[PDB]
Curated annotation (Swiss-Prot):
Species this chain originates from: Thermus thermophilus (strain ATCC BAA-163 / DSM 7039 / HB27)
Protein name: Small ribosomal subunit protein uS2
Keyword Transmembrane helix: no
UniProt-recorded Gene Ontology molecular function terms: rRNA binding; structural constituent of ribosome
Subunit annotation: Part of the 30S ribosomal subunit. Contacts protein S8.
Family: Belongs to the universal ribosomal protein uS2 family.
One GO term of the biological process aspect: translation
CDD domains attached to this UniProt entry: RPS2 (cd01425)
Length: 235
RNA sequence: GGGGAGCCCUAGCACAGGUGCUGCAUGGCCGUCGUCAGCUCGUGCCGUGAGGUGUUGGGUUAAGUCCCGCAACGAGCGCAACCC
């Protein structure tokens, strides 16, 4: 499944902007791109997906992060299929040191959902209502998937290794094992259980996250059908 | 017949009183900076630390009012706003 479908439509990318460690898990650099050695790909696939199966049988919280449009679409629906919080929006620097900040916004969000369905409609002048609508769409858009993150999330899949090494940075400081994906440019060793690949290829990520959902379901149950991407994959 | 209390007269004994100097000795109180929009703190990062960040970019507003990136998310005097 993996190696076959993988090579068939995806592997490496970027243009000699690479990272050292990358090169060791990689064959070639040829033409202008670094070519994913699918072997050890599948090796750490074994490590990581072992983890996945295990604590999917137990139950935990990991991210679907793609602050970039690409991944974004896919992961969002993946969340609305897997169950955990996701960060498609700009992951903000604060959560993993300022849990209380977010939790303030969050309890307040409970109260916001509350006062939405309330006789406070006609009351409190029109423009004011407009303002409250605006804060609504704020916390709504950003805290799209992530809204049900109660407790601490124990590992954090996520894509592109740079910005999402800012994400890595927070998780990493608060002693949290990183699962995550990377292309050519940035480093994987700040991650314990990495994933090399093409964070510019759409089919790659889709296959990965979709069958990873079906990995939690390989430990959970209910195996249905893959909808995300496909149509949105090449248009 | 006297003394005394309110009370009046002179002299004295305690002292009031003065728009005389000091707004670089003050209060309050204004003049200005200029409706100019700045000035800020709660949780946490960055540097050994002082300290920074917040608030520095792009449109845009009567405004740091706001939108997009954002070690940042909240709040203060403002700014707004209920009175006329």
């Amino acid at each position: 499944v993996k190696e076959l479908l993988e090579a068939g439509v995806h592997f490496g990318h970027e243009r000699k902007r690479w990272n050292p460690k990358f090169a060791r898990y990689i064959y070639a650099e040829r033409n202008g791109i670094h070519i994913i050695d699918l072997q050890k790909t599948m090796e750490e696939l074994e490590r990581t997906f072992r983890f996945i199966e295990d604590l999917a049988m137990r139950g935990g919280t990991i991210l679907f992060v793609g602050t970039k449009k690409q991944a974004q679409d896919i992961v969002r629906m993946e969340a609305e299929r897997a169950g955990m919080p996701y960060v498609n929006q700009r992951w903000l620097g604060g959560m993993l040191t300022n849990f209380k900040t977010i939790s303030q916004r969050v309890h307040r969000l409970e109260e916001l959902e509350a006062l939405f369905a309330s006789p406070e409609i006609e009351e409190r002048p029109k423009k004011e209502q407009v303002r409250l609508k605006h804060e609504l769409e704020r916390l709504q858009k950003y805290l799209s998937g992530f809204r049900l993150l109660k407790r601490l999330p124990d590992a954090i899949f996520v894509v592109d290794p740079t910005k999402e090494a800012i994400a890595v940075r927070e998780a990493r400081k608060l002693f949290i094992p990183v699962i995550a994906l990377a292309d050519t440019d940035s480093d994987p060793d700040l991650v314990d259980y990495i994933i090399p690949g093409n964070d510019d290829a759409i089919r790659s990520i889709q296959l990965i996250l979709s069958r990873a959902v079906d990995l939690i379901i390989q430990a959970r149950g209910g195996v249905v059908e893959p909808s995300p991407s496909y149509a949105l994959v090449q248009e």
